[PDB]
Ligand binder design. Structure first.
Ligand SMILES: [Mg+2]
Ligand SMILES: [Mg+2]
Ligand SMILES: [Mg+2]
Ligand SMILES: [Mg+2]
Ligand SMILES: [Mg+2]
Ligand SMILES: [Zn+2]
Lengths: 50, 132, 38, 217, 87
RNA sequence: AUAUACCGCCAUCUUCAGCAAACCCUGAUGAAGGCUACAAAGUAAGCGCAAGUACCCACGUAAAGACGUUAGGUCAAGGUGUAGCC
């Protein structure tokens, strides 16, 4: 559609959190989980409403 | 020893699929997630109520496709469109199979309040990645 | 709501469209407790 | 039906005329008759020994040569009847020579380390459909430490006949066709590979002319 | 131990058109009688006692030199080679 | 009530490298054992370590760590055997 376009990649925010490993005791043993959630910008420029 | 999602080696005669042969430190390293939705990205809400529906649909269909479900399902989610994909064994008659598509499609359409579409796949035997 | 989720699955065993293994595990085990118990 | 050319060369006596590739004189001049010390003789080289000279055991070359009309004849028949012939030694001083002689003829060599269970455990070491050798020819019946080979037992466990060079210290017992002769001498086994090579390739070309004669008649 | 049950039957007696009936020849739901599912319930439970007794069967095992003593009990002939050679 | 019936999730040696099905050999066909590359009977799938990935690299740190031991911890996360109350 001849649309003037650029792309850039915003830096990612990886929001890791921790949890206990056994069901009972042992706070010296954790397992930690993460979300890698990534980004993308689709910076279009100067296009009509239709 | 940590026993979170492994099956344990016993002999040479125990077959196992690709997924449950893989330990949970391979979740995005060697596996895919079994269900796709827009919940855990930040900051998005509706990550919370969906997964207590996500756990029903693989506890619903474990019972309504009984004895024939090959491995776990794939519960894709496209806007207001819940896309269940499933590979199922070739053991039942197909007249039964076509019954519980439209049974479960319009009973899961009228529970989630969305449309739901099923895509079955037929394999003759359970696909085994490891003779452990 | 946990009635909405758990009573619909009660009737869908009653009409037999959903065959669950946990409550099968009771009503066969409860069969073999009432033979002696109770 | 192809049993006309199998049941002639069992009735004929020295059918390949193998009594021309040696006598005692060819065996003397390549030092077959020398054996080791009387210190390390075996018990069962005792018939095959002429005597000791200043304690050096001397091997009966008459009792050698009455074996080799009979030992080279049998390994001719094994080449005639298309059976698998395995050459083994562990000499390390003729180990080039044995394998090179297996290419000069059309049969087999194995002169390297013996993997445990080569004949008694063949079916898992290889595929399940393997034709194991039908005669084994030894050129050193001893091993690189001086005890008899692994494949003198596993030949007899697998019920394979075996012609073997036995020298004054070797064990003649489980191997069916002993050849009481030298094996440590570089002139001796150049001779021994010369008679064993030529006695099978003559025996091969006997097998070629007979079936062709049967192909025409 | 799932063996007895068929995928359409529940003890509210509903004969669905796709399950539990011969295929389409009925395409109408059919709530049964109180007696016919009562007989199916005793068609069910009389079927379960048979595979209960067929579990509880005393096989006339042969007996080598005394019973519960793996003495001169036989086995079968040896299994063949992987390329023929029956025994 | 019983973690001494368990599943589930773990601790721990483990800041290890071994466990091993299926064969074969030695043992006079005894429990058993099986090593020497100038190689003397072992071969091997499978699991683990290793590799590879993640983080900022090959480094390091995580993550990983089989078989088993301590009848280790938990019926009170949730299921659930057996007994027990209604
Ligand atoms: Mg740990
Ligand atoms: Mg008795
Ligand atoms: Mg760690
Ligand atoms: Mg590693
Ligand atoms: Mg305790
Ligand atoms: Zn010698």
């Amino acid at each position: 559609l001849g649309i003037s376009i650029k792309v850039h990649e915003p830096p990612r925010k990886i929001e890791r959190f921790t949890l206990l490993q056994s069901v009972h005791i042992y706070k010296k043993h954790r397992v930690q989980y993460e979300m890698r959630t990534l980004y993308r910008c689709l910076e279009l420029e100067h296009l009509t409403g239709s | 020893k940590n026993r979170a999602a492994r099956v344990r080696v016993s002999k040479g005669d125990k077959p196992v699929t690709y997924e449950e042969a893989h330990a949970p430190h391979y979740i995005a390293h060697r596996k895919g997630w079994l269900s796709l939705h827009t919940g855990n990205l930040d900051g998005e809400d509706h990550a919370a109520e969906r997964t207590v529906e996500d756990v029903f649909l693989r506890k619903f269909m474990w019972g309504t496709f009984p004895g024939c479900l090959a491995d776990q399902l794939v519960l894709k989610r496209r806007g207001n469109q819940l896309e269940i994909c499933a590979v199922v064994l070739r053991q039942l008659s197909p007249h039964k199979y076509y019954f519980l598509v439209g049974y479960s499609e319009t009973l899961l359409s009228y529970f989630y309040k969305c449309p739901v579409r099923l895509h079955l796949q037929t394999v003759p035997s359970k696909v085994v990645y490891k003779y452990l | 709501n946990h009635h909405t989720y758990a009573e619909l699955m009660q009737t869908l065993r009653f009409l037999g469209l959903y065959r669950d293994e946990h409550q099968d595990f009771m009503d066969e085990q409860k069969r073999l407790k009432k033979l002696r118990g109770k | 039906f192809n049993d006309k050319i199998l049941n002639e060369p069992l009735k004929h006596s020295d059918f390949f005329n193998v009594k021309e590739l040696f006598s005692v004189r060819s065996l003397f001049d390549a030092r077959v008759h020398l054996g080791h010390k009387a210190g390390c003789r075996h018990r069962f080289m005792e018939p095959y020994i002429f005597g000791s000279r200043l304690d050096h055991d001397i091997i009966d070359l008459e009792q050698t040569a009455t074996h080799l009309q009979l030992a080279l004849n049998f390994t001719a028949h094994m080449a005639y009847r298309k059976g698998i012939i395995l050459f083994i030694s562990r000499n390390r001083q003729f180990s080039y020579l044995i394998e090179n002689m297996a290419r000069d003829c059309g049969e087999y060599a194995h002169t390297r380390y013996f993997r445990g269970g080569m004949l008694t455990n063949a079916r898992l070491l290889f595929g399940p459909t393997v034709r194991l050798p039908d005669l084994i020819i030894f050129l050193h019946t001893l091993n690189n430490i001086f005890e008899p080979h692994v494949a003198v037992r596993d030949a007899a466990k697998m019920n394979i006949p075996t012609v073997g060079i036995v020298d004054t210290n070797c064990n003649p017992c489980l191997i069916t066709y002993p050849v009481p002769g030298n094996d440590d001498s570089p002139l001796a086994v150049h001779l021994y590979c010369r008679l064993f090579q030529t006695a099978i390739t003559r025996a091969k070309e006997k097998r070629q002319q007979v079936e062709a004669l049967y192909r025409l008649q | 131990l799932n063996r007895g049950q068929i995928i359409g039957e529940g003890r509210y007696g509903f004969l669905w058109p796709g399950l539990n009936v011969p295929l389409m020849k009925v395409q109408t739901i059919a709530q049964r009688s109180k007696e016919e599912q009562e007989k199916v319930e005793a068609d069910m439970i009389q079927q379960r006692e048979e595979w209960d007794r067929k579990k509880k069967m005393k096989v006339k095992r042969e007996r080598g030199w005394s019973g519960n003593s793996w003495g001169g009990i036989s086995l079968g002939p040896p299994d063949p080679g992987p390329c023929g050679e029956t025994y």
